[PDB]
Symmetry: D3
Subunit: 253 residues, 6 copies
């Protein structure tokens, strides 16, 4: 077998990719999302009740569909990154990255020695299909994509430095965490926050990296798309389930 | 402790109850549905990948919320009915009921001996809260509600007979199974099917029984509500999740 | 490997065996019960939320301990008996057995063709340790023990006939189901019920079969032991957990 | 979306299909088997500790791979067939089929009314991808394949009759169950059994149905392939795991 | 919806709260404990085999009952605290807290930016009921209760400093860990340990914080209640299950 | 009850122990491996999708069999070590140990205070069988075995120092991680790597420590056995399953 091509990584330089957040945290719900036709599905290990085993089930569900899986670990934990890479997650979104030093540690966490610190366990990994992918150890990083989140003041204070780290493919802006860090908690739509988000997107793209963002606000998502943002998540499965069931009941109360 | 009051059973004679189908088959998804404020939630053991243990998890999720749980078993199987009652399901919807004899068997399956054939295991049952409900074995049937589905030609051929069975609290009409049985598979909206559904609803109510139905068609649901149908499900969680995610993506393609 | 010896079966002719009911329905709880030193543990597939997979987990937990596992299926269902035997349950307690014809069907359900109807799948079975027990198919029945419950009026009406069925090792009396069937629901301690239980025990032992019973009442359990009852369950894990936590709280209110 | 094409059904008339038995009963183990390149994978609900939910996980695992999934239910239970079809199993292998009447009931169990008795629940089914497959209810049976097992004397006594049932695509011969039924339990390699198996294969193919079989014996599997047997399983995952680990240890003991 | 009121937090200034340790690590066992009437239930993520998903199941079980849930994470890990808060744990017991600096980090781990470092993910959180609690982000901390354990020499060496940390609601004393740290392992009832525990309790209450402790020794528990200890756990589910099953067996040997 | 004897620990000074890697990550697969007769089974928490609860299931499976369980945690994390010891893992293999200071931290993580930092929670631990092992807290470390992996340049740079750490029972060499760290990724068979492995093995044994290694290469495994290596794993369950299924299919293509 040849390595599974990371089409999300390829498309970062060729098109704008529309994303759905998957926080329903099981293989059945991930498969329903996978039938819709999103460019990418974010399996949320940070803010949904997911562990390595529940993320594996969702990777296996989504694997039969064109939608590209991206996994967000709970933190930039190097052993957890090893685990998530070995179950076959090819794109990672690391939350709360705040310095070039931490971003460089995330790069190394995704690469085998001698260049990186990714633990070697190919015989056991769904990532190598248990060595059915014959040259996995020589070619794996070619299809690994590393994204980091800038979503704190220290993040923004280290933005130019993080954007000069080779092997960071994209910087994702977290409006919920960022708005809260800026004293506008629950109010990311404020001009003060949006002006910072827009400038941040322009700087990411000027340094030749992919810019990303999540907004459930259609108008803000279309505006981020008009600015050339490469990977835009436009909704969240839990939010769509709750809102659709509330809207339906309001037709009858 | 007193037995948990079956508010769904009480409201069959006092108000019209708005229902949501739950086929996402896990405790987390059931809890999201339970926060909306539906009168009832149908935990689907027939058409969603549920077993006794997954239904138990969803009962435990929903228990903290005012929405009343109704469980559909895969079939009118007497041992499975025993299992679902013991995990604390107070309202059961039996599919494909086709005779008074079968309807009477379902009544007996929900009542302790000597009058019924429900196996006795109160010490072990969430239904009795493991005997923390002190008189459970004397009072249990007071809060048990039995609904049967008429959704075949044989069911319609035995409708008057089923409607004379004491202990059947309600007859639910299944438009998908019924339209298929009538040679109008996937087309329940056809006048030939609707005329049968309307007459069936009038007969159920004329015999002093609660009538019920599921339609995701708002207009048909409101019409069934205008006819006095006591328990109307107006949507399905799997359908709402898929449709909401599809509608959102189409704003961006 | 040699077949796992069924010490419960052997001891039916040599000693009185003290049992604990296991309805906590998981591997961890089954293991706690296995450390106590009961002669047998009843894994309850009838009145606790168990399925074949949860029962397997509990067999695996208990396997490291001298306590002998007995599995009660939800009903005398021949395909479920097949499943429970193949996961390696060597002793089965069949509920609600009401005729010699049904008891003979249960015997056949436990034996390979050509003399029985047990489906053959030793390559796949924990029962054969995946053919690591080399002659499993020739010797399996030597370590299979079939118990049937008499716990209805029809049961009692067919008692002498069930007791002439070769391959029924033991008849277990269910006081909860029997007292209910006799119109003394939740009142098994009534003289009318107890007189029937005592005569039933004497008739079981006079026909050379093992007699069994469950009572959480110490005095009734000791009386059944004085009558020579071969397998006596003296308590239930769910009841002991609830009762000990209630008793502890009352010291503090 | 268009229905998932049942390539196993198509290939029954065009090539010989090599099968692996999957009894490791989880999604991870099913995915490892799915990487090998077998024409088909038998997910065993009869002789491995599987339920509807564990079979769904294995369907989701295997779905990303060319290997075609076949599900064996524990028995010809019509409600269980409904469940397995709705989770998206397109090929079923029914054990212990013993008459044209039972084979015809299995055909109907796989077809919607008015022609069959398959319960209609497309909105909820992975089979319809939750109605993402737009005309599922009109086209579903085109990609459903029904196989039945002849593996008893009554099976063989009704063979000509079962082979005249329209909608039975294939008859699978079970040498373990058949050898046991013929008084040669654990000894299917006996000439008396093999002569019956060969004649049975010739009769299946002469009536224009697909013949199938499992043998872990390479020589017998190649002989069944030389006779034109359309679907041949050549090994079992549990057997290969145990045998490979035993063979490895014997190099060191 | 309004935020779920934290009655445990409110009662720290108004009454003494009787607790039960929950280490049986599943939703069903948690529900049995929830029926008893304890003021609080400690879901033990440190010393029982729990993960975020098993803890969620137990929160969901307990949610239907007046008993207040308290969750002990395995360690004062900021990302795990984030996870446990988002699944809706309103009271946290942090083990092995040893400095004011660590206690202040725990406070910040429970509060949103800009004043704390709790990651923002309300759309996905059971804590916000998926934004069904409309102002969750503004009001969440009002119903969050932070308890820290002092159970090491370094803890005791930093006690006055931890007790001046604003946002620490309570200090829980761990006699098992403390007695071990003092060289009296498994002997917490020693006068040298008890004298330290009594002085620690008096100092906690003199600084206006709630004092807590676990003892399965009734006499020590009542003594701690006489000293005015605000939250006293009086037993452990695993210990009560094992002890009640042992005591029952000894009546029969 | 007496503590479970750690036969793996005893045999480190008396015989050479043959090991099988278990990365199929479930209780059923672990039981199949446990029936083979390996001296030890490595439950891989680092490179297979395991968590504390799945490792517990595999400990319970293996407990009934003579094969000794060794658990590899994902990293030398002190709270995770506490968790794995409490579920009853008596032998731990710590990956990527790179200094005497880290090796000494691992020793302390496995011992109760006051000499170590293992959290005390015996009442809740399968390790103590919930205090059914009466003196557990006094005797536990006697049956605890700590192994550390040297599999980096820093590890080799600190080898003599790690080998002088009292309480390190064995040093395991990881050829995959070591070959990668030496710039020979996927090529451990290279003379430059093998010469380092052989010298490392001689130093470990000269310092009176047990040496260990994994090789799926029979010739290399036998050579390590000829050098006196005390614990040699000779294969991996995932590799044996995939290879055996591939080899079987190639006989038929
Ligand atoms: Ca199940
Ligand atoms: Ca888990
Ligand atoms: Mn964020
Ligand atoms: Mn229907
Ligand atoms: Mn009974
Ligand atoms: Mn067969
Ligand atoms: Mn402690
Ligand atoms: Mn390694």
């Amino acid at each position: 077998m040849v390595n599974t091509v990371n089409y999300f990584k390829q498309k970062l330089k060729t098109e704008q990719q529309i994303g759905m957040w998957v926080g329903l945290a099981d293989g059945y719900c991930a498969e329903i999302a996978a039938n819709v036709g999103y460019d990418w599905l974010l399996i949320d290990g940070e803010h949904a009740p997911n562990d390595v085993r529940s993320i594996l089930a969702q990777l296996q569900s989504i694997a039969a569909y064109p939608s590209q899986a991206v996994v967000r670990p709970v933190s930039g934990d190097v052993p957890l990154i090893k685990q998530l890479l070995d179950i076959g997650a090819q794109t990672l979104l690391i939350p709360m990255v705040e310095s070039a030093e931490q971003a460089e540690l995330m790069v190394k966490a995704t690469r085998y020695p001698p260049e990186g610190i990714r633990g070697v366990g190919a015989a056991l990994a769904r990532a190598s299909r248990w060595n059915n992918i014959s040259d996995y150890l020589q070619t794996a990083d070619e299809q690994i994509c590393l994204l980091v989140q800038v979503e704190s003041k220290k993040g923004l204070d280290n933005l130019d430095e993080i954007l000069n780290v080779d092997g960071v493919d994209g910087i994702f802006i977290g409006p919920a965490d960022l708005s809260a860090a800026l004293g506008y908690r629950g109010n990311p739509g404020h001009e003060f926050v949006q002006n910072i988000i827009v400038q941040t997107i322009q700087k990411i793209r000027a340094a030749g990296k992919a810019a990303g963002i999540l907004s459930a606000d259609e108008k803000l998502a279309k505006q981020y798309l008009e600015l050339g943002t490469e990977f835009v998540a436009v909704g969240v499965d839990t939010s769509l389930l709750m809102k659709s069931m509330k809207q339906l009941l309001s037709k009858f109360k």
